[model samples]
Target: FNILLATDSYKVTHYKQYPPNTSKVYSYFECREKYEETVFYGLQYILNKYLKGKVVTKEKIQEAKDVYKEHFQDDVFNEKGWNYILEKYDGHLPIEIKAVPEGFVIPRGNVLFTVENTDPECYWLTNWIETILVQSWYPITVATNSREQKKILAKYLLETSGNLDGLEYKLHDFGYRGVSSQETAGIGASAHLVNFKGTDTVAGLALIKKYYGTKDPVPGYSVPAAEHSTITAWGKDHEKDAFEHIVTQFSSVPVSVVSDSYDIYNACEKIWGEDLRHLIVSRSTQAPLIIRPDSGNPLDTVLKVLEILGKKFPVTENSKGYKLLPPYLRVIQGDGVDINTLQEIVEGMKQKMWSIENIAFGSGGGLLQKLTRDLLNCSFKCSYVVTNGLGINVFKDPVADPNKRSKKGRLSLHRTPAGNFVTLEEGKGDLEEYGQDLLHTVFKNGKVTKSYSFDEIRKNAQLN
Candidate 1:
């Protein structure tokens, strides 16, 4: 895709909307939700996918000119300005970007990154890129959503299981088909992997390998899992045959089967528990056969499966004194499993004296599709400006909502002595006085100045 045409049609007219003598525009991207801690990610992906290389070209500029002319029936396109960028920068973007390290959970409502024109001649370039850069919200929101789930998971995990081991694979990604596009699946699923490693989205693995700078052949792991089609295709009378097939076929590793094709309890009690009980225990590996309940009420179905499996097999006690499922079996709730239901089921287990170790979770639309920009209160606004070669303070103070107000003047994102992140106005605070500027120059004039690996990002994303 051509960079010039990647922005909104209104941005094409913005070059003439600004006040006269507007030499430069300085802007910042921030989440206004007051989340106190926002997981920052996806900027590097945008840079690599869209902003890198000679994005501006003679052919692209001409193409944009003709498209805008036919659409608007006017000569509002700034072809001269674009040609200036082509001649001056050799088709590289004439803008500078500084951002907090990717994967850092920084303070929300503070500046996570800043963008300014590197060359005063291309003042409109700063906000023109907004259309592309604002996509950082997708990954940041997905990451924050995943991290929030991880937090809830850790709390119950510590209480019920008495340990946080294997927490990375607790929440698995099943959102590949649920998302809007393959690119959306790749970006969103990869964001989920920032907190957890379990995934079924192959798009996400290819994404991390390409953009996240991972050396591993594949960054995410998934077990051989069966869907409804595979089981129901055997005919309802042959349900037990379907269950027995996966148990015997994937015996070498942990395998998953959707056991709620017709009757969840009967499948758990008769088919899996009685008919194929021998193969499960004799499966020659410590990895258990994971049973997935895909329908009915999450709390009712999950606990019911646990109750049947518990009595049908054998139960042991963990160090925390909660009832643990047998080593040969586990459960995953894939249907109706969102953040609230997940927490509800875990809370249900803690009260029932069941260890959370007996279960895992899978998410599709909840993990990647069910969100909006307003959920995070995100925005990109011009906080500082330059007119007639003089610094200008700028912000939008909507009387309707004071919280919608934007910050003013040039800004620097810094961490406090107490380890909390805070933003400061330019010419007001010392960068070294509070702490070093958290915003590093990640992009300058179309060149990526800094980069990070997927594993290194995982290290920084760990809970403090």
Candidate 2:
């Protein structure tokens, strides 16, 4: 099986012990967080890789059977599931799925996607895929997080910079080295790129081009930048020499140099503000030098660097009275940045009357690995079932926690006239009688009915 073994272990173990008469399972996935309803992504990968290919082969069936037996040490090896998939599905999967377009703003409580059995005998497959499908929530949460960061940056950008020209490159991805694995960096970075265009993760660029069909110059971009090792390799006494090389070496293009290898404030005031000020300002046509502060409290370090740079360089004031640094100099705070701290930094800049354009933000572990599916309260539950040709509504309501209550019967996700999402019962009055249903069939009977290009998805990703 091409399925990652980690995901294989996620399936319900008792699925093998279900009643012999179990014939159908219907499930829907939802994001319960009220704030994250604005950006839903990552379903395209699931449909393309899991549901489109030949999922049920004799070899895969045997592999699954062997793995299950070894893991559970039970005599039963899901013989019914293996045989049914081989005989009826003909190497094709047996599920129907409907979802909102990738990158759409799906509201909370509205089903983001629904999955069910195409073959009554393969009901167990619904939850079987759940093990892997739920992994998509990782990317979904990252996409929403990245989008929220963009909104925050945009808000401050407007107030300080008086325009949104630099919104795309405001938050750079420094998360590749911080993520647990290459796969995680690729997936998480692609989600981040859905909102902003700056990235330091090359694997993520490869992923978007390979999976999302991005081409003709690619979707995300990065410039030459130095890391701690590059600066630290030079002895402490040679820090100025290292800084000088970076400025002179990459003078033709924009470059980010980590300036906190030793003393960050000293690097800003002495090296950049004093020694290299003439070199930087003299290059009238080249990109600006980006000085990065990578340690300590991000907000405090940002303010300190801003104050130091302001004293050393000529400052112009925007009509909004925000202090704008000269075009040759800028600061990038790449430390301790997540959603909360990111907002705090911008708020602090506003309080200090400094333009948001004076600083750029970056994140490593915070952007790539700090989140979980629970961030969005993601859940997958069976809402309906069919057994012996009889339809049944299913639900779970815990008196201790009503928030865990699940929906009942088959469901359809519809959009109101104002573009708000609403969930409705499947067999209810005409869907058009309410409003346009945004959910369309993307997968059915082991085939993908619809797919989107990267540009198409980016267009649908708009916040408003």
Candidate 3:
């Protein structure tokens, strides 16, 4: 894709739209609605993929010229500015970006990042890249949403299981096929993995290796899990044989087999519990066999599976007074799970006196696909501009909706002595009181000055 064509078509005319003598335009990115907490992430991905290096070129300029002339069919394309950048700076955009370190957690309604033109002549370049910069919202939302879900899982695990050990593997990522693009799957998966270490999204693992690699190729893990078709293909009469072969083949490693092909109750009680019980009980793998139940009311189906598994397999009572299924035999409810159902299902397990460790979750749409930009009220808007050497604080204050109001002046993010963050606009506080801006200069003149690794991000996004 042409770098110049990456922006919204309407933004092509923005060079001429700025106030006369506008030397610089500054903008900040933030989530207005409070999520109680949100993680800053994926900015490095944008920098590496789109902005780093000599992004503008003579050919790209000619391409943008040809495209925009036909796109608007009018005098909208800013060819002279492109030529000026090509001639003066050798095709590198003069833009600077400041952002919070990736994986740093904070409440919403605070600035996560800010952008400005580095050279006065390139004032229109700041918002020109807004289209790509806004892509940060995806990984941010994924990481934030997954982290919030992690808290829910932890709350129940502590209540019923007494420890958060292995919490990283409890919620598996089944979102590979559910996302739209491979890049979306990879970006969303990488964000979700920042919170937990389990994922079935290979694109995410590849991205991790390419973008954030080191001691480990990928920080996440996955098991050999089966889908409905894999089991149902063997025919109803040979279902027990399919179970027999699966457990026998993967006895040395963890594996998941869908058990609801014919009848979930029959598969659990008769096929797995009765006929193949010895094979699973005498399995050689330290990793347990995960029986996946697909379809039906999640809570009810999970409870029923537990009830039957308890009757057939050895059950141990934990100190928390919760029943634990045998290590070699467990259940994973992979259907109908969402933000609401995840908590309810865990609570249901607690109410039924079953350990959350006896089960894991596999989410597709809920984890990677089901979200909107408004989930965090994400927005990037101009906060300040320098025109004719006069600094003017800019903002949008719609009387109709205060929530739609924008911040004014230069924005700086800082942490108070109380360990809380406050973004003072236009230097509202004393220099010693507010301290320097916490937003670091991550990008300048088409160079990425800051970078963070995968493990570093994981450590920074530590749970409260």
Candidate 4:
């Protein structure tokens, strides 16, 4: 049920008892003004069931009308004076719903769900659902890719580590600043870290900690044990200046010297190796050293550089002059990292040509960039269609493009104990949530339906 959905509805369905008189509702982005919490929460719920208790306030319980406001005509903002209804209405409020689970894997252009409110009298709400729906899908889409990116990264890291015979470490999302929007960045970060352990993600660390009950402390920054603020710009003197600055300023923080600051091999021998080697070797505490090849043929660059360091700076009693030189040194590649680059590096290391373990990847555009304009042209569609106003769920793509087209209708997946192909949609009309149920009515008769918590969703997502 961890499906993801994308829709574009502007109408927010407000619960009305007798088809309460009609009025127009508009989106906030169009006017750039604030409105009532009730309206926003109502629309948010239809878009994402994750936020439930955030809507209710002291002045209103299920008072959706009092909170929703039309901003096109407003200068002052307040929720007072709007008379609201506090009526005792009790029944399972069947909110019209069409959505995919928040974390489900989806193929391109497939419908996740299509919802139309069930109350015959409350049809007007549909008008305000689109705009908010647009904003909602951005996160859902990013999160799905973030998680998928994690798998791709983890596999690369593991394979790369095995080749160099180095201890396995973790990879994290460092592309927030590169994403199109701040919100999209947050979702993308969340997606990548969901499956892998991370070291630094200050904002993500704090929010995710609160979302899930964990007391883990965040790492200070991306400093190896030996360097700090170590720039990788080209030029023999320029590169040398940067390396010296890191060593002089933050003595303890590991310094990563980008060897390919100009020409990788030349910079390593003539620039960094000459000046920094003596000092790094002199440090008492074996400070870590990272060498980044920001450009060049990734596989060849890593192999050639590592061979140079291995031959010229082999671990020995004399080499102890640079205590931070031998055991703590590492090679990092940043520019051209993708699944393919990662695979090639690992394969070379297997043939004893490259030392994959000496490498770490700092992926940017290429890593997080979408496979296609639509992020692999992925879309989560409503699996079920309503015929005659009833749930007429069916599996339309059991044979054709099964991976690209979705499992039509409400989907329920079961992992096989033998670790083989999983089960899908166990029976008729029995919703196996795979855990993506978003349209739960959290308020009824001016009372809270349930307390909302992201922690619950995180735990629910973690079960599998």
Candidate 5:
């Protein structure tokens, strides 16, 4: 495959040029680390898959020198030794790689990507490529899943004939501060929300703007608020004490009450109704109030709270004592919320004859944290095996068993007449055979002369 590289994709944004409160050297290192390897490998895998059957005896490294000069040419990645290693053993090494497009919807138990030894002699390259790609895929998965859940929620609301504007100003990513890694929680969660056309995520908005241009906190003219941490804990006096502190400090703010801190129902009925209700209703003056059920079956508990609140604060055209109540006293569920549970909760709301609009989910473990084995399932398996001094690069199955075997040889993803993607692996034996190309050449000869920035990639990812 002949490769044409583009030097840069985006006009560098102000935020990209000047990251806040950071030293010049630190930011420069950060910039390269965030982008260099991923771009190099992205083009690397794409070329391997695209050139599967091409009879190019002499593998060309093309602008491989450019990459060496720009990235490896430095001390950052062990420049001198690593440079010599690639130069001396370049063609002698074999590498296997697999790549799926950023936005492709992969079926369950399918390989998202793969990498293997193209040459048995170059075992080190297998480990090297695999390790880099491994870390990269998780952020992609977490972000994708989070974004899809928002889509599902949006779908449910649209199906029920509710306005998107109702949620337009109301979404909050309260999951990040509670998530495991500062990186995954902050940045990964931001990417996930990016999928949903979310209002704002503290971590990713600048990148989004830089990449996509016009970084509105909410897309399509939707503005929102920051929930921060609700200050509720899981022990006794949790809701009451926390609520008191939050209200005392942030009384003017649109409040979120994490009701299940100790006892969900009791807090709402006994404490919230008495201590907080007046402030929540009159003082807050119909501003949004969020009741977060952080534990137990979120669907059921939220339904019960909504039902009780409906009775306690009945609707009246004229003046009712609670008519001054908030517009969005919505439930924000936290804990394990995968697609199955999320869909189930939406369906459960329907069963109770309640609209899904009354509840906005806040997924944690299933979205950011891996709970079950199945939910945590993802793999980046090998796609190509380059051998014979990069002379005979063959595509092979990363999974090679009939039961455990991933489809063997060079596979191309095709859109069937029915619009579902066809994973073409073992083709029927014929007098004549033809090869198909699903992956494209993005890089060549180990160099990315032309490359897009992280902002550009993030934008492309959102478009997908």
Candidate 6:
């Protein structure tokens, strides 16, 4: 929480004094992900928490000053020094924010956001929030990963099922419990909701309502599902009773029961296939029974269950000559489902002539926690500076790797006639250049000038 107010003391000390006649500092943020597509998110959160609200309190400033002196043995961050810099601004930040619209699909190398000092004296404040600004990349990364998974589902659904209506609920969120913290789950799962409308992470719902101004949020939906504890409570010998109780209790509504508590194969073949076949087949049409196989290799275990269920139940074919399952039965493979394994499962289903509609996926750690900034290669650096009354185009080009070179000069994001994003050099374009520039001033001088609701962001997230 302390870091949210300002960056490291070293950053504070490093730039404590500017060169004579230094007037401005400008910087840009981008994702150099190896891939072509990346989703933009989390800037609104930064504006809401850091810029819009009174984040720099007198108490907080004193805390920061104490921390700085303790770390560096120098009184470089006291309120006496900070008061003069902040007093003219009335506890508000003195900076301008230009950014891409939330939920926009930015191609690699496009600027996602930029920061510049409005008042020359506050140039250090621009980079002060650099640590927090870069935090936005996590949600963007998660959202992009989720969107890619949806694309995969959409492809197979169109090819095998010949319809894309149920694509929203195909991939459910199982990542909440697997994450490092509840806050991480909230952020990651909300990103997932930007693509699909199924989730098991409750914290995501709370986040949207609190941050995005949703009165009552339903960004994603979930059904009653059992866990390993519920299934194992009945003991191994009484597995059938556990499965039976689930169907009997939630017979009128859709529900998922974990079938891998003891033996997934036997549970599918004997328990669900034979013992409760009539009950599942004749269950109310309003709700279908979802069987969850939570363990084993994603590809083989899913196919084994499909083969078993296909034998015991009715099967039909889609227009593409792929096998489909009856409405009463389906399987959800929740374990070992990363992007790689997900693609493998889809490919395997296509090769076996099975419709993707017969099964869905549940991703946990892979969907939410297993990622690093390097995946997208996100970086924020000063692009331009005004020193000694002269404009300088600042950049870095390490001879070791040219790809790591940073851009130069103050820049703006512009869209080509083809609707692709391009980073225009400084002064090449202005914000008022109708439809040509993608960067808009969402925040100026510590106030949020423009904001979007949850629905608006969700609508924008579905790019073509």
Best by lDDT: 1
Note the Cα lDDT for every prediction shown: 0.88, 0.81, 0.86, 0.42, 0.44, 0.82
Residue pairs with backbone overlap in model 2: none
Which of the two candidates, 2 or 5, achieves a greater TM-score against the reference? 2
What are the TM-scores, per candidate, against the unseen true structure? 0.98, 0.95, 0.98, 0.60, 0.58, 0.95
Q: Arrange candidates, best TM-score first.
A: 1, 3, 6, 2, 4, 5
RMSD of 4: 10.3
Model 6, 1-464: lDDT tens digits are 55434575556764556566667888889996435788898788768865674555667777777777777786666465356445777667777889988888888987889998888766676777788788888899999999888888899888997789779989999999899998889999989988888999999887877787653447779888899999899888999998898888998888999988888888888988888888988876458899888778788989988988888888888789999888877778889798889988997999998889888899999999999998998999888889867898888898999888888887888767787777876556665363566788988887898887877777788947
Q: Which window of ten consecutive residues has the lowest lDDT sum in model 5?
A: 25-34
Worst 10 residues of 6 by lDDT: 1-10
Regions of candidate 3 where Cα sits further than 4 Å from its true position: none
**RMSD (CA, Å), each prediction:** 1.3, 2.0, 1.3, 10.3, 13.4, 2.0
Give residue 77's lDDT in candidate 3 (0 to 100): 86
In Å, residue 246's CA in model 4 sits off its true spot by: 0.8
Q: 117-148, model 5: which lDDT tens digit per residue?
A: 43333333443333334444455555555545
Question: lDDT-based ranking, best first?
Answer: 1, 3, 6, 2, 5, 4
TM-score, candidate number 1: 0.98
Regions of model 2 farther than 4 Å from truth: 1-20, 33-36, 284-286, 429-431
Task: Give the higher-lDDT candidate: 4 or 6.
Answer: 6
**Total backbone collisions, model 6:** 0
lDDT of 3 by residue, 1-464 (tens): 56799999888888888999999999999999626889998999888888888888989988889888878878678888878888887887788999988999978889999999988888988999999999889999999989888998999999998899889888888898988999999999999999999988988888888776747755788878777787878887898888888777777888899988779899888988888877888864367889888879999999998998888988999889999877787778778677789999998888878899888887898988998888988899999999999999999999999999999998888888888898888856336475677888988887888888988899889888
Off by over 4 Å in 5: 1-101, 106-127, 166-173, 177-180, 197-214, 217-253, 260-263, 274-278, 282-286, 315-328, 371-377, 380-386, 389-401, 414-418, 423-438, 441-464
For model 2 the local lDDT of residue 5 reads 35
